[PDB]
């Protein structure tokens, strides 16, 4: 499991040695530490490295944390309920758990909270609205001797320039396939898995695209199908939704009509109803449609253009299927 085997310190990290050394350098003198922003691909291990850095700045009790609740009152009598992850040395807030009320929680909670300082971990800073980021802009500078921010995000694109300047930027590159394979080797020798040939582990990396969280989860999911004994041709158990998307692309390239558009809409509804975001659906659908060797460059260019257009539409809209079906119809018209 991902959680059973996870590093708890900086000396327990097993990839990106230069990043571990940079973190040790940054934690050598912990009091004169500026705000930090960890950015990189999703599933690299930045949330583990931030906790490992806190374990170097403070005692080992940083992992012994508790979940509490705090209530807020907006301009109306709608009560905002937000759970907080707190520790005797730091606290974690995730403003991605609500709508446009991120600014209120951010400003009020950070003002109440504001070695000698208490660390703050802002999870998924990309969901922070521009107004909440503007509110945090001056809170980052006014209280710099009591509150230090460690913002974990996957892309600095939606982060405003003032916030980018107000904190150090630390990039976390995805681990190489070799390091992923070495980690999976230790995991399968500790979990007592049976490997007929080691190269399968490499293939797992080649199916994860640098994601360690996805790699270990897929390894464990396919270890339950092979009954704790992975063979030489164990089927990479691509998440059910990936198989559904692949079948959808097969249906797209096979038949281009309105009767097939109805069943495409039905598949989109069944995918959206099971807690699957539409942006990821569109991304996977487009990327796996470009992989279709039956199409040519003229078709793939139009497909990527329509996918960008409808991605903008979906980012500007709320009825996601209204854009997904339109993109599917435009792709059908292109082919």
């Amino acid at each position: 499991w991902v959680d059973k085997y996870r590093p708890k310190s900086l000396n327990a990290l097993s990839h990106n040695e230069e990043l571990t050394n940079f973190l040790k350098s940054l934690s050598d003198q912990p009091r004169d530490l500026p705000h930090l922003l960890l950015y990189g691909p999703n599933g690299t291990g930045k949330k583990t490295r931030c906790m490992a850095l806190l374990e170097s700045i403070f005692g080992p009790g940083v992992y012994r944390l508790k979940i509490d609740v705090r209530q807020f009152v907006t301009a109306s009598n709608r009560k905002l309920e937000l759970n907080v992850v707190s520790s005797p040395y730091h606290l974690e807030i995730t403003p991605s758990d609500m709508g446009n009320n991120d600014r209120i929680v951010i400003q009020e909670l950070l003002k109440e909270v504001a070695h000698r300082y208490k660390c703050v971990i802002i999870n998924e800073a990309n969901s922070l609205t521009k107004d909440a980021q503007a509110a945090l802009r001056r809170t980052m500078e006014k209280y710099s001797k009591n509150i230090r921010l460690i913002m974990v995000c996957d892309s600095m694109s939606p982060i405003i320039a003032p916030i980018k300047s107000r904190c150090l930027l630390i990039r976390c590159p995805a681990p190489s396939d070799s390091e992923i394979s070495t980690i999976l080797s230790d995991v399968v020798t500790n979990e007592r898995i049976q490997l007929e040939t080691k190269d399968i582990l490499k293939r797992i990396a080649q199916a994860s695209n640098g994601n360690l969280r996805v790699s270990l989860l897929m390894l464990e999911s396919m270890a339950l199908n092979n009954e704790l004994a992975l063979k030489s041709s164990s089927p990479i158990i691509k998440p059910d939704w990936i198989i559904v998307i692949h079948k959808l692309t097969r249906k797209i390239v096979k038949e281009r009509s309105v009767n097939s558009l109805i069943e495409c809409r039905a598949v989109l509804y069944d995918l959206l109803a099971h807690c699957i975001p539409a942006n990821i659906i569109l991304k996977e659908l487009t990327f796996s449609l470009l992989d279709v060797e039956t199409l040519n460059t003229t078709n793939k260019s139009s497909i990527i253009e329509y996918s960008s257009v409808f991605d903008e539409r979906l980012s500007l809209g709320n009825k996601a299927i209204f854009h997904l079906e339109g993109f599917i119809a435009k792709v059908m018209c292109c082919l």
Partner: protein, 339 residues
């Protein structure tokens, strides 16, 4: 007293450690500080409106001016500083600002008049005036027009358009220029020598080149490079590559993208984009670097340049809406590869 302040400055980041304390520390904004120094001997300081890019030194300039005017004793008694972290509605502007303006100037001490000019007026500064609503701004009109004998108003903003036209007409407009390599290389070299920052020949000028008219970001990048070079302890000099690595920019990876765009089909470009998106880079920075390279390089046709400019504009406009960076970057590279 003063020694505690010196130690706190020495244990402070370089942005606040080297904040200009006098009007002479301003390196590039000379046109404004010349007038500010001339009016320091006179007593006809008009209402001022500082505007320009962020990190040009507006707040530092006004702080240094107020210091040189009032001394460290009257610095806390004849100044009303209102930032964006405070409430600045109509009620606040009508009650607090107007009560402070209507009040008389505090009496200077015997030590104040001997060293400082001590003008007969006080200063009310409003930092980040972009967040002020237009009605609360119009409320300040007669407040600053009738009580000008006892108080002077200093507005500070980044976008001069956010301030109403009457207020922009009542105040003298001071535009702070972007701090590029030319007019800030002296300040950057001074900061580097004061901190023993051993770098190469074209590092500092490069840093400001990445800053794009922002001395604060340049000083932060210099501090980060100095920390990264002191942790290693190799005793070598900081390189431009090491600076542009931590600044969010490498040149070789961009040249690889140019080669894949020039020569290559849809499949190779898609594969290289999928590989490049594994290493975390902001798509906005990649688009900006591609734009700089394509527009600056004198090896492409003008017909190609119009199309590359329009495509980069469309890609930036689409990325400014929260779209997926991978899809937009792939679409941009594919569209510019067909050219």
């Amino acid at each position: 007293s003063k020694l505690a302040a010196e130690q706190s400055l020495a244990q402070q980041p370089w942005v606040e450690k080297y904040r200009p304390k006098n009007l002479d520390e301003v390196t590039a904004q000379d046109h404004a500080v010349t007038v500010l120094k001339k009016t320091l001997k006179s007593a006809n300081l008009p209402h001022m409106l500082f505007y320009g890019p962020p990190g040009t030194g507006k707040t530092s300039t006004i702080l240094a001016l107020t210091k040189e005017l009032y001394g460290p004793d009257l610095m806390k008694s004849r100044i009303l500083e209102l930032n964006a972290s405070d409430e600045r509605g109509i009620s606040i502007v009508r009650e607090k600002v107007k009560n402070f303006a209507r009040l008389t100037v505090s009496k200077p001490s015997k030590h104040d008049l001997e060293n400082y000019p001590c003008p007969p007026y006080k200063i009310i500064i409003l930092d980040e005036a972009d967040s002020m609503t237009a009605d609360a701004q119009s409320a300040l009109r007669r407040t600053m027009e009738t009580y000008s004998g006892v108080t002077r108003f200093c507005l500070i903003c980044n976008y001069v358009t956010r301030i109403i036209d009457p207020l922009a007409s009542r105040c003298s407009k001071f535009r702070f220029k972007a701090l590029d390599a030319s007019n800030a290389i002296d300040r950057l070299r001074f900061i580097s020598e004061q901190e023993n920052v051993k770098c190469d020949d074209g590092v500092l000028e490069r840093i400001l080149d990445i800053s794009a008219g922002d001395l604060r970001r340049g000083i932060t990048l210099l501090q980060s490079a100095s920390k990264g070079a002191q942790y290693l302890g190799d005793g070598k000099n900081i390189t431009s590559t090491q600076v542009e690595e931590l600044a969010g920019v490498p040149h070789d990876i961009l040249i690889e993208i140019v080669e894949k765009v020039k020569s290559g089909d849809f499949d190779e470009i898609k594969k290289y984009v999928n590989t490049f998106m594994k290493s975390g880079w902001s798509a906005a920075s990649v688009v900006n670097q591609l734009h700089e390279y394509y527009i600056t390089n004198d090896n492409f046709d003008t017909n190609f340049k119009n199309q590359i400019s329009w495509l980069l504009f469309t890609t930036d406009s689409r990325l400014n809406n929260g779209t997926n960076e991978h899809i937009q970057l792939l679409n941009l590279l594919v569209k510019i590869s067909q050219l």
